[PDB]
Design a protein around this ligand. Structure first.
Ligand SMILES: [K+]
Ligand SMILES: [K+]
Ligand SMILES: [K+]
Ligand SMILES: [Mg+2]
Ligand SMILES: [Mg+2]
Ligand SMILES: [Mg+2]
Ligand SMILES: [Mg+2]
Ligand SMILES: [Mg+2]
Ligand SMILES: [Mg+2]
Ligand SMILES: [Mg+2]
Ligand SMILES: [Mg+2]
Ligand SMILES: [Mg+2]
Ligand SMILES: [Mg+2]
Ligand SMILES: [Mg+2]
Ligand SMILES: [Mg+2]
Ligand SMILES: [Mg+2]
Ligand SMILES: [Mg+2]
Ligand SMILES: [Mg+2]
Ligand SMILES: [Mg+2]
Ligand SMILES: [Mg+2]
Ligand SMILES: [Mg+2]
Ligand SMILES: [Mg+2]
Ligand SMILES: [Mg+2]
Ligand SMILES: [Mg+2]
Ligand SMILES: [Mg+2]
Ligand SMILES: [Mg+2]
Ligand SMILES: [Mg+2]
Ligand SMILES: [Mg+2]
Ligand SMILES: [Mg+2]
Ligand SMILES: [Mg+2]
Ligand SMILES: [Mg+2]
Ligand SMILES: [Mg+2]
Ligand SMILES: [Mg+2]
Ligand SMILES: [Mg+2]
Ligand SMILES: [Mg+2]
Lengths: 73, 88, 119, 101
RNA sequence: GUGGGAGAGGGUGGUGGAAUUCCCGGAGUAGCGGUGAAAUGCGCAGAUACCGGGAGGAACGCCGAUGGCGAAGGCAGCCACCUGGUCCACCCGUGACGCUGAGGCGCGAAAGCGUGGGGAGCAAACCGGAUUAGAUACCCGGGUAGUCCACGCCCUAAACGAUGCGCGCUAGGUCUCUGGGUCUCCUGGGGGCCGAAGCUAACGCGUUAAGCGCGCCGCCUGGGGAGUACGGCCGCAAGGC
């Protein structure tokens, strides 16, 4: 499935290699701190591969979560 | 690593004529540069085997070129080896 | 001997047993219950019904402290998890929120042979 | 001489004197390792996704510099000596990679 | 040679968070655990469940793929340094400098060995509980070597594509990773699937050949006896060739 919406389709021009930008990056994470699959992010192998590394960098800096509690349920 | 100025320096040092990047002298000089650098790297980091294979291949290539030079013009070969300090 | 009136409810669910710890807003336990706290002994503690009874028992013991609202935290995947939540749903307590806190490793420790091939 | 970006998270509970002291220490340690500073960005106190040293917040510093490679690690180590420095991350500069261009 | 690219290729140092165990404190009480069902076990010297603090070892969730890199073994948190291979564009330089490769040398998963560290989890042997006609097992509770690090050995394997390396030649289609370009498409290097000719005992293979050819290496010659005996070489031993 995952035909609802995609993240690359939402945002405009943005830098994938910028780890200090939380506003952009946090859109690539789920309800939990998990990094979204390509079928969600809408990105490509290279793009995704870069995104992962920058998100991990942002996590280490303390800007992004490694994990989050799941609500609802 | 090996910067551009170093490489250019040795290239223009061993060049047969101005503008020669390809002659056996130059090739053996560049190979020798890399071999020395790599061996220096493997003085420490002696547990790095994958690079050691690189060293082997480089040594082999160099020895084959030198073999060619020896067979072709023994004088240029003598001069080369004398200059670089290879073969003992 | 407190009169807390608002707090947390931790549901810990296993295939073997379900157990419910009701605490204050700082996480300090007030009362608790489980499959074995009620009559159940063997495999029956793992039953959804046992989780219902454990949840209700915990909630009653909690309302003896005069408590009204709880935030529910759910850990573990097993039978009687959703039943425990569903019992607390209306136990006489107001459930303000539900959250799955179930702990998962980033693959630190080797599981027992029973749990291997999946990590 | 290569380009690097230095990320430094600082204790949010600092007053101006102590903060200026920390920035002095950082500046001096930078200069002592032969790092020339291309530019600097100070974002101040920002919230964190997770607590660091039992602090919900952090004070962020950014220094884009050009320094000799051989000293880089030793620089990082130095910046980590102080107690008020929570994180130090030194990244080799890279050109931006844009999506949706 | 020049200018660029991708990558879990390798080595060293640093660093991050989740989880497990243990210790300290708080709150709290009669069980927890575990199975087909149970029991051993742990718990009133207060466990389990919950919060806070600390210590330590080991492995890196999501990304993650039908993906990538490596000659093979194999390689996965992040950062920096050192370093191997490789692909593309330009058509610049040398002028056959090539291919293969007995022996030699190096590398070589796991287990195992020596010395010293380390030791959270897991766990051969072992100690117990169950099941069974028995149960030297499968299931449950413990648990030592070991698994981790340093240095030195061992040299094996379903070490597998069960397919030696190099070169040339023989329809296409489709999906994918990574370059270049006059960027719908063309062109180059990888990874898959279906298939022309052809091959094959069949299964299947089919520009990533198991087709058509040439060069060089290794190996086979019915099954059991047997990877045994003997000899030699290697190893501290186990044992290997
Ligand atoms: K078949
Ligand atoms: K013998
Ligand atoms: K022994
Ligand atoms: Mg480079
Ligand atoms: Mg049970
Ligand atoms: Mg180049
Ligand atoms: Mg690189
Ligand atoms: Mg690597
Ligand atoms: Mg305690
Ligand atoms: Mg015990
Ligand atoms: Mg007892
Ligand atoms: Mg405990
Ligand atoms: Mg300890
Ligand atoms: Mg393999
Ligand atoms: Mg030319
Ligand atoms: Mg000519
Ligand atoms: Mg050869
Ligand atoms: Mg080995
Ligand atoms: Mg081993
Ligand atoms: Mg040992
Ligand atoms: Mg055990
Ligand atoms: Mg029987
Ligand atoms: Mg018996
Ligand atoms: Mg056992
Ligand atoms: Mg023994
Ligand atoms: Mg010992
Ligand atoms: Mg295989
Ligand atoms: Mg194809
Ligand atoms: Mg292809
Ligand atoms: Mg046919
Ligand atoms: Mg086919
Ligand atoms: Mg016979
Ligand atoms: Mg035989
Ligand atoms: Mg046989
Ligand atoms: Mg044998």
């Amino acid at each position: 499935p995952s035909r609802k919406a995609k993240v690359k389709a939402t945002l405009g021009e943005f830098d994938l290699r910028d780890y200090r930008n939380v506003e952009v990056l946090k859109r690539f994470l789920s309800e939990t701190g998990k990094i979204l699959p390509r079928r969600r992010t809408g990105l490509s192998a290279k793009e995704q591969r870069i995104l992962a590394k920058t998100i991990k960098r942002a996590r280490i800096l303390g800007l992004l979560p490694f994990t989050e509690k799941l609500v609802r349920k | 690593p090996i910067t551009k100025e170093e490489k250019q320096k040795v290239i223009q040092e061993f060049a047969r004529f101005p503008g020669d990047t390809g002659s056996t002298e130059v090739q053996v000089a560049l190979l020798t540069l890399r071999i020395n650098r790599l061996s220096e790297h493997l003085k420490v980091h002696k547990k790095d085997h994958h690079s050691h294979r690189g060293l082997l291949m480089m040594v082999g290539q160099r020895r084959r070129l030198l073999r060619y030079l020896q067979r072709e013009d023994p004088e240029r070969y003598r001069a080369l080896i004398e200059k670089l300090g290879i073969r003992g | 001997k407190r009169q807390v009136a608002s707090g947390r409810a931790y549901i810990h669910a296993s295939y073997n047993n379900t157990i419910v710890t009701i605490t204050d807003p700082d996480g300090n336990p007030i009362t608790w219950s489980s499959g074995g706290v009620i009559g159940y002994k063997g495999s029956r503690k793992g039953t959804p019904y046992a989780a219902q009874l454990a949840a209700l028992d915990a909630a009653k013991k909690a309302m003896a402290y005069g408590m009204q609202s709880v935030d529910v935290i759910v850990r573990g995947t097993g039978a009687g998890r959703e039943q425990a939540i569903r019992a607390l749903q209306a136990s006489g307590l107001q459930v303000k929120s539900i959250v799955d806190d179930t702990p998962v490793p980033h693959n630190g420790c080797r599981p027992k042979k029973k749990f291997r091939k999946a990590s | 001489m290569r380009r690097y970006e230095v990320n430094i998270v600082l204790n949010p509970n600092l007053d101006q004197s102590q903060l200026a002291l920390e920035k002095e220490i950082i500046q001096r340690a930078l200069e002592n390792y032969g790092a020339r500073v291309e530019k600097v960005e100070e974002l101040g106190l920002r919230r964190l996704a997770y607590p660091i040293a039992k602090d919900p917040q952090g004070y962020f510093l950014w220094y884009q510099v050009e320094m000799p490679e051989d000293r880089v690690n030793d620089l990082a180590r130095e910046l980590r000596i102080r107690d008020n420095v929570r994180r130090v991350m030194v990244v080799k500069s890279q050109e931006p990679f844009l999506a949706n261009a």
